[PDB]
């Protein structure tokens, strides 16, 4: 299991002060949001089980994200300075961080990475005690964060508060977070030539998002020949995916779709059944 | 809960 926060800060010179958006996830379930462009910005719930928290939870999260809005304004100014960039251009800082939970209920792995204009900028290393800077400007940040002991702060959070509250959320949302929804599956067939047809393997309504959809021909994986779409949200917190191969007419019986998902008791093997 | 306080880059 995991917890992640995703932050986006966007400058917009001439059209207001920088905008700050935060979203939080447990596994693939979004549970909170904050957007500084609201009239009176507040942290809001995005899954029902987080509403077991009291009003103080929402006020405190709102204080933190309001402060982040101001701090990222300063970060945007600092980075413009590092790169000698005009005040007239728009720029974006992104950050994603959080914890992966181990079998003993303690930290398995911690994560913290930031980006500038969609490119790697600085990352906390897996030892949670050192940084990887992507360029010369990020080495300015690195020296500042080394002096300020940011890595110690993040290590404590990732080993402590992060795992403590991830476990709390998993227990409070156990009935939805800790039950996998298996995919509903089928295979479709459509001619594309006198001599070729598409076989498409569908996986619908599954949770969590992690899944393996593979076509085999005579039991051999067809990875390089398989079109896989990006896993996509259904809108009801479950996911959808398909995988397609173009095959010679008359060979369809040689092809099997294999589905692996946490919700399935055993992996599925599917065939086209006209 | 998020990290309680962010540093400036």
């Amino acid at each position, epitope marked *: 299991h995991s917890m992640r926060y995703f932050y986006t800060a966007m400058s917009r010179p001439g059209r207001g002060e920088p905008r700050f958006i935060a979203v939080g996830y447990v596994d693939d379930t979004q549970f909170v949001r904050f957007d500084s462009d609201a009239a009176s910005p507040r942290t809001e719930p995005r899954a029902p089980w987080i509403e077991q928290e009291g009003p103080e939870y929402w006020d*405190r999260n709102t204080q933190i994200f309001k402060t982040n809005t101001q701090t990222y304004r300063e970060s945007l100014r600092n980075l413009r300075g590092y790169y000698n960039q005009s005040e007239a251009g728009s720029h974006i800082i992104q950050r994603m961080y959080g914890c992966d939970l181990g079998p003993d209920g303690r930290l398995l792995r911690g994560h913290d990475q930031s980006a500038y204009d969609g490119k790697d900028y600085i990352a906390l290393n897996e030892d949670l005690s050192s940084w990887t800077a992507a360029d010369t400007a990020a080495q300015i940040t690195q020296r500042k964060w080394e002096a300020a002991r940011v890595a110690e*702060q993040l290590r*404590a*959070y990732l080993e402590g*508060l992060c795992v403590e509250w991830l476990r709390r959320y998993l227990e409070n949302g156990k009935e939805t977070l800790q039950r996998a929804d298996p995919p509903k599956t089928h295979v479709t067939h459509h001619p594309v030539s006198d001599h070729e047809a598409t076989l498409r393997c569908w996986a619908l309504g599954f949770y969590p998002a992690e899944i393996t959809l593979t076509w085999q021909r005579d039991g051999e994986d067809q990875t390089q020949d398989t079109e896989l779409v990006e896993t996509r949200p259904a809108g009801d917190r479950t996911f959808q995916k398909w995988a397609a191969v173009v095959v010679p007419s008359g060979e369809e019986q040689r092809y099997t779709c294999h589905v692996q998902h946490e919700g399935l008791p055993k992996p599925l093997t599917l065939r086209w059944e006209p | 809960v998020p990290l309680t*306080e*962010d*540093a400036e880059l």
Partner: T-cell receptor, first 112, second 113 residues
Framework: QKVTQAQSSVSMPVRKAVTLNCLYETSWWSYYIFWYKQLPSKEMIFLIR?????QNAKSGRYSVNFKKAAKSVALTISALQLEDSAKYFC???????????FGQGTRLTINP | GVTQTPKFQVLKTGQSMTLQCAQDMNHNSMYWYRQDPGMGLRLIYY???????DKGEVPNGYNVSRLNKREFSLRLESAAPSQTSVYFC?????????????FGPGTRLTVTE
């Protein structure tokens, strides 16, 4: 008191150690404790910090025995010097705002 | 570090006075506290950055102004004897672990009738 120091005045010989007690209450999930000392000039001097997510703090002759479940954060000063005489304050900073809540302090007199 | 002026002040009841604070550490978070005799410090106002004062969070008898990144002022609008106190400004960095507040030298303020 939301932050309570148990002693109002303590005396101890040079070269010994002293422990100054501090208990606090909070419902915040993230906080810090700070120990300061105040000189006769009224100047306030930072000594040592204790984070709610960190192990027992140590800084030179200062250490904090952080008993988190008991919300106890006693300061111990080792190898006492005459220059350690001062009024010592325990302060709680909660969450992101860090609006410090102070104990009423303990006067420490180091005796030659 | 953090500077404050004046270090000492006497006022008559009803007089107004502006206390000045400045810090050169590139901090955003700044604070005003007061310390009565024999007591700890009590917060008057926390200024997280430049911006407009939240007057609903300013205690009666005071005006607070964050003038720029470095400078922070506390005014006693009509001094009362109950406002006799040592007024401390403080500032701190945000982020990392070294978030302890740095105090100015204080303004020792006595109000007499």
């Amino acid at each position: 008191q939301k932050v309570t120091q148990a002693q109002s005045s303590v005396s101890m010989p040079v070269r010994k150690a002293v422990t100054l007690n501090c208990l606090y209450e909070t419902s915040w999930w993230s906080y810090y404790i700070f120990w300061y000392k105040q000189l006769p000039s009224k100047e306030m001097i930072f000594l040592i910090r204790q984070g709610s997510d960190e192990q027992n703090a140590k800084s030179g002759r200062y250490s904090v025995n952080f008993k988190k479940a008991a919300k106890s954060v006693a300061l111990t000063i080792s190898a006492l010097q005459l220059e350690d005489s001062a009024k010592y304050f325990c302060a709680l900073g909660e969450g992101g705002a860090q609006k410090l809540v102070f104990g009423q302090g303990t006067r420490l007199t180091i005796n030659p | 570090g953090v500077t404050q002026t004046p270090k000492f002040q006497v006022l008559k009841t009803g007089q107004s006075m502006t206390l000045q604070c400045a810090q050169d550490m590139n901090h955003n978070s700044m604070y005003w506290y007061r310390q009565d005799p024999g007591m700890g410090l009590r917060l008057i106002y926390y200024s997280a950055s430049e911006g407009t004062t939240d007057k609903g969070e300013v205690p009666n008898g005071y005006n607070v102004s964050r003038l720029n990144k470095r400078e922070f002022s506390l005014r006693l609008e009509s001094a009362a004897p109950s406002q006799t106190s040592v007024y401390f400004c403080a500032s701190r960095t945000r982020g990392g672990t070294l978030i302890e507040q740095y105090f100015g030298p204080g303004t020792r303020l006595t109000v007499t009738e």
